[PDB]
Amino acid sequence: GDKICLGHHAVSNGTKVNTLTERGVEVVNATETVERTNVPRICSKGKRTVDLGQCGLLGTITGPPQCDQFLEFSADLIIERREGSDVCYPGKFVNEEALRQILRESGGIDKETMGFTYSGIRTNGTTSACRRSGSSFYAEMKWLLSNTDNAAFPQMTKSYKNTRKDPALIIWGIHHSGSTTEQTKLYGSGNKLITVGSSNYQQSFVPSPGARPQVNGQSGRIDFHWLILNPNDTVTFSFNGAFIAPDRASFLRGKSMGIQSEVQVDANCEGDCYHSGGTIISNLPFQNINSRAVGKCPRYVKQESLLLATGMKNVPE
Amino acid sequence: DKICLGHHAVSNGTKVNTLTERGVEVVNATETVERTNVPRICSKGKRTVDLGQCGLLGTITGPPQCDQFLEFSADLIIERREGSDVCYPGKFVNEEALRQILRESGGIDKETMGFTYSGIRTNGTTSACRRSGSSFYAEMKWLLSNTDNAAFPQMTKSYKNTRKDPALIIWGIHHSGSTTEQTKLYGSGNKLITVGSSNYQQSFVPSPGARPQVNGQSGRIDFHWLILNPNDTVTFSFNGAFIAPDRASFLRGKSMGIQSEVQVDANCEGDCYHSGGTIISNLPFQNINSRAVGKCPRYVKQESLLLATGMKNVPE
Amino acid sequence: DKICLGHHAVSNGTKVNTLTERGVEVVNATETVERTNVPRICSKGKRTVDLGQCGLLGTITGPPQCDQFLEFSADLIIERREGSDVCYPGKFVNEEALRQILRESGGIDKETMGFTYSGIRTNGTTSACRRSGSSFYAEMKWLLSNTDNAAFPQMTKSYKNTRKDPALIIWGIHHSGSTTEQTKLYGSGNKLITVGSSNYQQSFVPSPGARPQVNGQSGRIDFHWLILNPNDTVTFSFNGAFIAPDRASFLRGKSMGIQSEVQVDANCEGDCYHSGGTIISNLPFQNINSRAVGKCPRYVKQESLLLATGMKNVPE
Amino acid sequence: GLFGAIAGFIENGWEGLIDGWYGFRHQNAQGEGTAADYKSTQSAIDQITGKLNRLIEKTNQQFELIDNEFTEVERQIGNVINWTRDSMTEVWSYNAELLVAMENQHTIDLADSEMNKLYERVKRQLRENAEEDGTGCFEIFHKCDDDCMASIRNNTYDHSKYREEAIQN
Amino acid sequence: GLFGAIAGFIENGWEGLIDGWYGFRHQNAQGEGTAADYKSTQSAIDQITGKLNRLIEKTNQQFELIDNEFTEVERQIGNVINWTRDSMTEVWSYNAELLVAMENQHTIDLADSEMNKLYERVKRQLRENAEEDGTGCFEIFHKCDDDCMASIRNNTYDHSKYREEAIQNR
Amino acid sequence: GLFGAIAGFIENGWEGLIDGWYGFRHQNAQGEGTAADYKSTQSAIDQITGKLNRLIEKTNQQFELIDNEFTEVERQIGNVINWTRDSMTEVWSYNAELLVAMENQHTIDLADSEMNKLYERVKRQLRENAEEDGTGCFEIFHKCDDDCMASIRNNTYDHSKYREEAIQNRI
Ligand SMILES: *[C@@H]1O[C@H](CO)[C@@H](O)[C@H](O)[C@H]1NC(C)=O
Ligand SMILES: *[C@@H]1O[C@H](CO)[C@@H](O)[C@H](O)[C@H]1NC(C)=O
Ligand SMILES: *[C@@H]1O[C@H](CO)[C@@H](O)[C@H](O)[C@H]1NC(C)=O
Ligand SMILES: *[C@@H]1O[C@H](CO)[C@@H](O)[C@H](O)[C@H]1NC(C)=O
Ligand SMILES: *[C@@H]1O[C@H](CO)[C@@H](O)[C@H](O)[C@H]1NC(C)=O
Ligand SMILES: *[C@@H]1O[C@H](CO)[C@@H](O)[C@H](O)[C@H]1NC(C)=O
Ligand SMILES: *[C@@H]1O[C@H](CO)[C@@H](O)[C@H](O)[C@H]1NC(C)=O
Ligand SMILES: *[C@@H]1O[C@H](CO)[C@@H](O)[C@H](O)[C@H]1NC(C)=O
Ligand SMILES: *[C@@H]1O[C@H](CO)[C@@H](O)[C@H](O)[C@H]1NC(C)=O
Ligand SMILES: *[C@@H]1O[C@H](CO)[C@@H](O)[C@H](O)[C@H]1NC(C)=O
Ligand SMILES: *[C@@H]1O[C@H](CO)[C@@H](O)[C@H](O)[C@H]1NC(C)=O
Ligand SMILES: *[C@@H]1O[C@H](CO)[C@@H](O)[C@H](O)[C@H]1NC(C)=O
Numbered sequence A: 001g002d003k004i005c006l007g008h009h010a011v012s013n014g015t016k017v018n019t020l021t022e023r024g025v026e027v028v029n030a031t032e033t034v035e036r037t038n039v040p041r042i043c044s045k046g047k048r049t050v051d052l053g054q055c056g057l058l059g060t061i062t063g064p065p066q067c068d069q070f071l072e073f074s075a076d077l078i079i080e081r082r083e084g085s086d087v088c089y090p091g092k093f094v095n096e097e098a099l100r101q102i103l104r105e106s107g108g109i110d111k112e113t114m115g116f117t118y119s120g121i122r123t124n125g126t127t128s129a130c131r132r133s134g135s136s137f138y139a140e141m142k143w144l145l146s147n148t149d150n151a152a153f154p155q156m157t158k159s160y161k162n163t164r165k166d167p168a169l170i171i172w173g174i175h176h177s178g179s180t181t182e183q184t185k186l187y188g189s190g191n192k193l194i195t196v197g198s199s200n201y202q203q204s205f206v207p208s209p210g211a212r213p214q215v216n217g218q219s220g221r222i223d224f225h226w227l228i229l230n231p232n233d234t235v236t237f238s239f240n241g242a243f244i245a246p247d248r249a250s251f252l253r254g255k256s257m258g259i260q261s262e263v264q265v266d267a268n269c270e271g272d273c274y275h276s277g278g279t280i281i282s283n284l285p286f287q288n289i290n291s292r293a294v295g296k297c298p299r300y301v302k303q304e305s306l307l308l309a310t311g312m313k314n315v316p317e
Numbered sequence B, C: 001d002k003i004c005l006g007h008h009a010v011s012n013g014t015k016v017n018t019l020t021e022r023g024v025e026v027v028n029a030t031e032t033v034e035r036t037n038v039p040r041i042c043s044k045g046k047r048t049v050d051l052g053q054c055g056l057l058g059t060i061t062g063p064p065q066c067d068q069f070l071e072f073s074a075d076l077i078i079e080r081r082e083g084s085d086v087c088y089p090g091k092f093v094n095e096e097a098l099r100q101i102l103r104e105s106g107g108i109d110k111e112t113m114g115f116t117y118s119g120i121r122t123n124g125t126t127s128a129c130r131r132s133g134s135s136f137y138a139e140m141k142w143l144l145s146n147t148d149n150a151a152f153p154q155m156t157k158s159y160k161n162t163r164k165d166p167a168l169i170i171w172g173i174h175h176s177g178s179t180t181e182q183t184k185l186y187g188s189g190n191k192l193i194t195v196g197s198s199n200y201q202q203s204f205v206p207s208p209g210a211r212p213q214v215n216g217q218s219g220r221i222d223f224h225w226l227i228l229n230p231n232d233t234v235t236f237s238f239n240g241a242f243i244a245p246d247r248a249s250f251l252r253g254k255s256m257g258i259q260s261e262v263q264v265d266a267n268c269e270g271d272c273y274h275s276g277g278t279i280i281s282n283l284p285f286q287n288i289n290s291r292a293v294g295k296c297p298r299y300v301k302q303e304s305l306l307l308a309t310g311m312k313n314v315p316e
Numbered sequence D: 001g002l003f004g005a006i007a008g009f010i011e012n013g014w015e016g017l018i019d020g021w022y023g024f025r026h027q028n029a030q031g032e033g034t035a036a037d038y039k040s041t042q043s044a045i046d047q048i049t050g051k052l053n054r055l056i057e058k059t060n061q062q063f064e065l066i067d068n069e070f071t072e073v074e075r076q077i078g079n080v081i082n083w084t085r086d087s088m089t090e091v092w093s094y095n096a097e098l099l100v101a102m103e104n105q106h107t108i109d110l111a112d113s114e115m116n117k118l119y120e121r122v123k124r125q126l127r128e129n130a131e132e133d134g135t136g137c138f139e140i141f142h143k144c145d146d147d148c149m150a151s152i153r154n155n156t157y158d159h160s161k162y163r164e165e166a167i168q169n
Numbered sequence E: 001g002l003f004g005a006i007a008g009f010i011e012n013g014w015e016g017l018i019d020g021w022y023g024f025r026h027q028n029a030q031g032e033g034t035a036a037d038y039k040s041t042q043s044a045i046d047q048i049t050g051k052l053n054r055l056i057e058k059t060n061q062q063f064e065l066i067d068n069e070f071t072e073v074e075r076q077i078g079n080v081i082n083w084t085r086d087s088m089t090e091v092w093s094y095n096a097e098l099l100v101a102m103e104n105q106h107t108i109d110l111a112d113s114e115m116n117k118l119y120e121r122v123k124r125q126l127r128e129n130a131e132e133d134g135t136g137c138f139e140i141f142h143k144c145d146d147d148c149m150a151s152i153r154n155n156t157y158d159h160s161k162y163r164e165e166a167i168q169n170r
Numbered sequence F: 001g002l003f004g005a006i007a008g009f010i011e012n013g014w015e016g017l018i019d020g021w022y023g024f025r026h027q028n029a030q031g032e033g034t035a036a037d038y039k040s041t042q043s044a045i046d047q048i049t050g051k052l053n054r055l056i057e058k059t060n061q062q063f064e065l066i067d068n069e070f071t072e073v074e075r076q077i078g079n080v081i082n083w084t085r086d087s088m089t090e091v092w093s094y095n096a097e098l099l100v101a102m103e104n105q106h107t108i109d110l111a112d113s114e115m116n117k118l119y120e121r122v123k124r125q126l127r128e129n130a131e132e133d134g135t136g137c138f139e140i141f142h143k144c145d146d147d148c149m150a151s152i153r154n155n156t157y158d159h160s161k162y163r164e165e166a167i168q169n170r171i
Helices: A065-070 A096-104 A180-187 B064-069 B095-103 B179-186 C064-069 C095-103 C179-186 D005-009 D038-055 D075-125 D146-153 D163-168 E005-009 E038-055 E075-125 E146-153 E163-169 F005-009 F038-055 F075-125 F146-153 F163-169
Strands: A003-008 A015-018 A023-027 A049-051 A077-080 A091-093 A109-113 A127-131 A141-143 A156-161 A168-176 A194-197 A202-205 A221-229 A234-239 A243-246 A248-252 A257-260 A273-275 B002-007 B014-017 B022-026 B048-050 B076-079 B090-092 B108-112 B126-130 B140-142 B155-160 B167-175 B193-196 B201-204 B220-228 B233-238 B242-245 B247-251 B256-259 B272-274 C002-007 C014-017 C022-026 C048-050 C076-079 C090-092 C108-112 C126-130 C140-142 C155-160 C167-175 C193-196 C201-204 C220-228 C233-238 C242-245 C247-251 C256-259 C272-274 D022-027 D032-036 D130-132 D137-140 E022-027 E032-036 E130-132 E137-140 F022-027 F032-036 F130-132 F137-140
Touching (some): A023 F038, A096 A257, A221 A234, A234 A243, B014 E075, B022 D038, B095 B256, B220 B233, B233 B242, C002 F075, C022 E038, C220 C233, C233 C242, D022 D038, D038 D075, D075 E075, D075 F075, E022 E038, E032 E146, E075 F005, F022 F146
Parallel strands (some): A077 A257, B076 B256, B090 B220, C090 C220
Antiparallel strands (some): A109 A248, A141 A243, A168 A221, A168 A243, A168 A248, B002 E022, B108 B247, B155 B233, B167 B220, C002 F022, C002 F137, C014 C022, C140 C242, C167 C247, F022 F032
8 A cells, every 4th residue: 555755865976985984985965175276376465565576585685786676675475586686796695594584574674774984994895796887786785995905904893782672683794805815905914803792692704715616707705694683782893804894784574474486476366375386275174286385274285185075875776 | 651761951061062063062071171370390209400590501611600500410400591601701502402411411420621731820710700709610721821921832631531421521712802812811823722532523713802791891702512422532732712621521310401480399299391380280282381391281272172071961 | 483683702802992991802803003023124126235334425535445335326225333434534514414415316426527736746645544555535636735845836626517417526624633744744824725606605724733543543534515506616726735526426316225233135025114124014003113214104102002803792 | 884774774865856865755545756854954964064164264373484495495404394394294194084084984974864863753753553664664554645644744743543543454 | 963862852851860861750640750770871971981081191201392482592493493393283283173073973972872772772671562652752551650660760570461451552 | 882782782792603793593493593694794894894994005105314323413403303203203193092992983883883783674574573572582473484584584584474473473
């Protein structure tokens, strides 16, 4: 005779997933859990953005021609480019990456004169590696000479107190001339000493003239150095030549986030997870796009794919 | 007439999270993340040394603050914000490496280097290290020249490590405020200071010039150290500007080092410490301080994570 | 008369842990943590090079121990406790960085720098570097002055990297036991040694003085190294005390480096290695050695963690 | 698997049923028919979306660069950074694959469970006026018309109103 | 959820029952009454405490400082240390939230399961002398006095001793 | 625990049964006997091996040395390396102990579950021609010979072919 029967649904085409117990079981419906789709632009909508282009982050502090428009920038988001260069006259920074990490999160910088003042020397030393229109130099810095070639360089001391509420970024340079005879034409003769102290920091420098391969037509080099001067603390500079003096000190504006990217800015899309090939916009817990992404990101995983069941076992005829 | 089974309930349950639902009410729950700190350093049963004003590294060179700590012994070492390593201004190279070694040494045991001197002064002192009037680093010797501007005559001194364990050897470079001061002190010309073992080669020149003054001093001492292996020898070739070690140090055993801002208390015990006290707890997790050290529950972000200890709560 | 269903059991079960209970007995279980080590380096199928007495870094400078390894090729590199980088005493700067590069280089391919010399001696040797009688680092040149106390005439030498990959450039600073020895060797006055590329600026002064003697030597060599990019040039300005590179090095491909105390064995295969041998295993976890490298089960603290592979065991 | 119904004593599912997850098929005098049960269907769905909300969320945890794609940091620190980053990749891939397998076992089992619960409640509505077929069917030992059928479906069905009659057969 | 009883075919729980986790309420000639089942109650409790002991334990793993609150270490190594520490905070917060959610699902389900098991055993004691009400009740098709009621409760109840009688009334 | 059968309403297991995981013991006219059920047994086994394959696999993730057993690296970096390595040891030991406990709870429960499912199917084959004993037994309210017994076992047993007869004896 007559009866009642209960059952459940199914579909002709299910999706298969993994369980604890079996690999490739078919369920009515599933959903992805690992993000594969990148947006090939830096989604920057709503955020104060500064794209350094040709200026190197560290050049932001010393001031080569590329960086003139960035000596006092302000940003929530900072973008470094492959093309960017920290330098016009050839040289390096010591602890350069520490510095970059500080500057990336500073929210930008605010300059202020050291108020150094000079007598018994030249101040205007320039070079054709640093061209504005004709020979020029690091905008934040002063190429300290002796009155004309090969005059003596008269022992100097200069000091700067940090009278502000926050710590200062103090910078300076050591010049290594192509020759010993060049060191001479510039800063006179004999070997040269350059010391630097605070309440916090003791260190010391001698120049090292000699041939390097030429870079923007130069066999010489500048070594750049820096330290963080605490509020109320004083830095002093004892020196006798070969020295590249800071004209201005720097202060950090607030807070930001630094990225390195190869793609275009786009104020039409928003996101907080960035990598050099773009922005990962997604709600998902995981991603397989780029393990070096920075920001607020889904966790990077190895798998291309991990399906989460969102329905029952699929049982057809 | 009939029989019916059922289960309990209560008017006021506690709600928790499950895999499947947020805020479901269960008969009873218990906490899993520790929020309660004890604002003291619970040190009961443990050989404790509170450095107070002495800096850990000062323990090795010997400024006035550290006179009572030149040979300490501990299971537990406490560093204080007020503590200072130094009397005459200066720094240690690889200073944090050193602190990490000393924090777990169970303390130190000193022993003379047996250095002996002729053709110079040994007694150079300063008003930055006052005992009663001018003195100096207790473990160290301020090496001069016979009086003002005399020459400094090239010296070599060597020390063999004749003990079963490695030695902590220390020494100092002096950078005078002037070049002319470097002169009144150790004579004239530039100065070299080398240092070798079977293990370690390095070399030092002084750097006179103005620094801002600190305890009324424009000069500085650079401190250096190395670990001398058993049977190995260190030797010191130098020609001035040198601050010689009077004694070598050996590590006593094992300990644990903390940095704290609170009082010792021998009435409570624990093994999880941080600068604001001790975390006494059985729980798997804590949200008090992510920098806690010792034997500690794992630090997590959440203030709270309730574990169900009863069934689902179903009232009328 | 009736039908009854049931399930199996055994007299001797294995007990395991659950979420809910510790020590419950199941019909059968299996281990999950590997405890068994093979006390050999299982190297079957792999191009292997066991350096024995040669130190990996010696592979680059060329002391007598390393003569057979100046141009090796490997999938797998083995470093030995007995191995030494050096014949005349000294060190490499950033020595571990260098080892890490060399361990994964798949070996090295040498090529002349083509340096050529006039106005000096080239043949300076020593009894710490014996072939038959006094010699020297095979890849290097001990640069002198024409005889005892002669002057050392300022030199520049440059090398362009004309190849498709980066070059490993190396060189040495000599610190003589005396200042007077520095003299007999490279003449007089203080000495400067600079080194630049498009990529790298740095500078060196020698530091003569007494060190304890090591293979009968009070002197030392400081070795330095840099990576020269394709089409970049390195140049060497120097005025004495300099140990010049005869040949540059290039990396062959890819490999894996280990440090071991046991014998090679081409009869067994594995990819998980440590100093006491090879861990051959399918299991997810191991408790043999937390420093194992290769492709390894995850190291855990527990000796043992049994996985149930059968039902609850219920006997009478 | 676990509750023994879906892919268990029920043979297979119903492509026919496009209206919910669980349903009834009836067979009486006036023909055949089917319909979806909302209460059970909703309970499955509500639970699954519970899971989903718990996994699709928001780290508020910022990280920054410690590393440099354009000018490589120094090798030693470079290799410590890469080794650390690779260890965390090992941890998160393990967590991810495990989470998804775990959740999938549970999802499947709670769906099986929800079907079994629906069965149970009906067996119980029909105390004595029916027998379990064994393939998920209830053989009704009286005549029950479309209207009566819907009384089971919508849970307002008096059993003792066919009791005398059904017990008889 | 899972076993379909608690917050299932049972309507609700009993604030009345302060004596155990699971119980019986009976209705006969001589009035109403209730009482707690010890065996089932103990089994739930013992299992939950099993969980608790597993989670409230002892790391014997010491860690030390790599870092310095009073004199900051150098920035590069500083930032590598912070990045590492923050990655581990991410791992442990994830583990913690997951563990607690997982255990909670299971706790709730094993409690539901224990109630269902108690039901089952009684249905079975009463083979044929009763019907399932459907709301967690057993309608007894004979008279059963307080003393008989307790015979079900304490699991010594002969069914074929009311069989003739009860089968009759059904 | 969970499904209430193994270490539940079944008293204990059968050392006798060496032929499968789950079985039938019968008692009729012609004596006693036993035999293993392949379908249920296979389902338990297949599921457990499922687990095993998932856990005994292959990291393809290489790691190298960052550290040095023969010439110690510098202390600061040394201690950062050790701290990192110890943190990971904490993570993997926790994962390992958790995974094993979790899987063990589930293994045990799915074995219990499989027994319960076997019970169910038989109760249902025998609609009305038997009663649940309560200890895992089915009291058959007719005579059923070895051949009939095997008809239950091998799932081809017509219930309405003893229905008239059996319904009678339940009175
Ligand atoms: C499949 O999964 C997603 C996520 O649950 C859902 O939005 C969608 O409705 C599902 N597809 C179907 C056909 O139900
Ligand atoms: C630079 O300054 C000096 C005085 O300091 C001045 O005499 C000279 O003309 C200036 N040089 C150049 C190139 O402008
Ligand atoms: C620095 O010193 C001045 C004394 O003029 C004092 O007023 C101020 O509080 C100090 N600033 C800080 C930041 O400590
Ligand atoms: C609630 O939780 C704690 C931990 O299990 C327990 O000791 C206490 O008994 C519980 N409270 C009640 C009222 O049962
Ligand atoms: C220090 O020692 C010298 C001799 O080495 C001695 O003549 C002198 O008086 C001492 N100086 C002081 C201030 O005690
Ligand atoms: C050190 O040298 C002495 C020789 O007097 C010897 O007795 C001792 O065993 C040596 N030990 C080591 C570790 O070098
Ligand atoms: C016990 O466990 C292992 C893993 O499943 C298996 O290979 C072996 O067959 C089992 N032993 C017995 C006696 O069943
Ligand atoms: C090395 O070279 C010089 C000249 O270049 C030669 O006269 C001399 O014999 C050689 N010296 C030795 C020690 O063989
Ligand atoms: C190096 O320069 C040469 C010019 O001779 C050129 O052919 C080659 O492409 C260059 N390499 C790179 C990487 O540009
Ligand atoms: C670290 O890994 C990146 C890939 O993420 C690689 O390109 C780089 O060379 C590695 N660093 C070192 C120091 O070998
Ligand atoms: C690292 O972390 C602490 C907070 O834990 C912070 O205060 C400190 O400045 C951080 N270090 C650096 C170098 O940013
Ligand atoms: C790091 O760990 C090893 C053991 O894994 C230990 O022997 C070594 O000394 C430790 N390193 C430091 C720098 O203390």
